[PDB]
Ligand binder design. Structure first.
Ligand SMILES: CCN(CC)C(=O)[C@@H]1C=C2c3cccc4[nH]cc(c34)C[C@H]2N(C)C1
Ligand SMILES: *[C@@H]1O[C@H](CO)[C@@H](O)[C@H](O)[C@H]1NC(C)=O
Length: 254
């Protein structure tokens, strides 16, 4: 069925990230500090594909029924917010980097940047576990693990504003600023991949701010769009790494 095709699309997500990290770790001619930041995208996307996606596939297979203990329901959601957000902000840093380069003419700076990005992601993700889910029964086989509008109403709005629209505005500004000052074929196409997450957040804000909209109608659209988001997140690092020819030569070696 569709599950086989979905699994055949998940396998590349694990494959590409491990290929990228193997390319970085194996060779020494690609050891410049800017690749250390790409390592963060590689590991984040690898973790997403390894953990989040299979749970979603089983949630599709077993109809809205949790196949795991109750305690795991919040934690999974926490991870679903921790890694995905961590991806998006990373892209923003790349834009900033290019800006600095355009106005330019060490390892510590890269480590500081990575740490700051990850702390921002943790801060955004940490509201979820502390305020847990609410259910009428204690049996995991009778419940559905979905964030509700009533329990999380302000969190969804502010998390969508912080995680998506702020970095989006930052890059929209920095692109024009760079143009008012290799850089074109890459940035234009590598930032349009972000667009593939916009429909999820637009629909989420619509659900937050509409009191006369059919919730059931919007829920199916959200479920459809979330998978497109995962596809974009998984495909971005391979698309980036294939641009260089040294990476293409290295990949075939092992
Ligand atoms: C289809 C249902 N699911 C999965 C259970 C979601 O809607 C997830 C909810 C997310 C979410 C909500 C609210 C704020 C947010 N910031 C960052 C994310 C986020 C990530 C985002 N993940 C990717 C999908
Ligand atoms: C609730 O879980 C029990 C498990 O014993 C199952 O038999 C029952 O059909 C479930 N109720 C539903 C799915 O409405």
């Amino acid at each position: 069925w569709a599950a086989l095709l979905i699994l055949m699309v998940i396998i590349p997500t694990i494959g590409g990230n491990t290929l990228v990290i193997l390319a970085v770790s194996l060779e020494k001619k690609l050891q410049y500090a800017t690749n250390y930041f790409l390592m963060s995208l590689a590991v984040a996307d690898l973790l997403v594909g390894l953990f989040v996606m299979p749970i979603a596939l089983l949630t599709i297979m077993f109809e809205a029924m949790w196949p795991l203990p109750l305690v795991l329901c919040p934690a999974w959601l926490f991870l679903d917010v921790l890694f995905s957000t961590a991806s998006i902000w990373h892209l923003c840093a790349i834009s900033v980097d290019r800006y600095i380069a355009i106005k330019k003419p060490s390892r510590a700076t890269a480590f500081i940047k990575i740490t700051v990005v990850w702390l921002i992601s943790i801060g955004i993700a940490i509201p979820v576990p502390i305020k847990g889910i609410e259910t009428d029964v204690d049996n995991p086989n009778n419940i559905t693990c979905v964030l509700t509008k009533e329990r999380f109403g302000d969190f969804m709005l502010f998390g969508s504003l912080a995680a998506f629209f702020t970095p989006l505005a930052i890059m929209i500004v920095t692109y024009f600023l760079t143009i008012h000052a290799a850089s074109k074929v890459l940035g234009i196409v590598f930032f349009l991949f972000l667009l593939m997450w916009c429909p999820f957040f637009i629909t989420n804000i619509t659900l937050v701010l509409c009191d006369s909209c059919n919730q059931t109608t919007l829920q199916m659209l959200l479920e459809i769009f979330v998978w497109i988001g995962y596809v974009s997140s998984g495909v971005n690092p391979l698309v980036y790494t294939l641009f260089n020819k040294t990476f293409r030569d290295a990949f075939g070696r092992y």
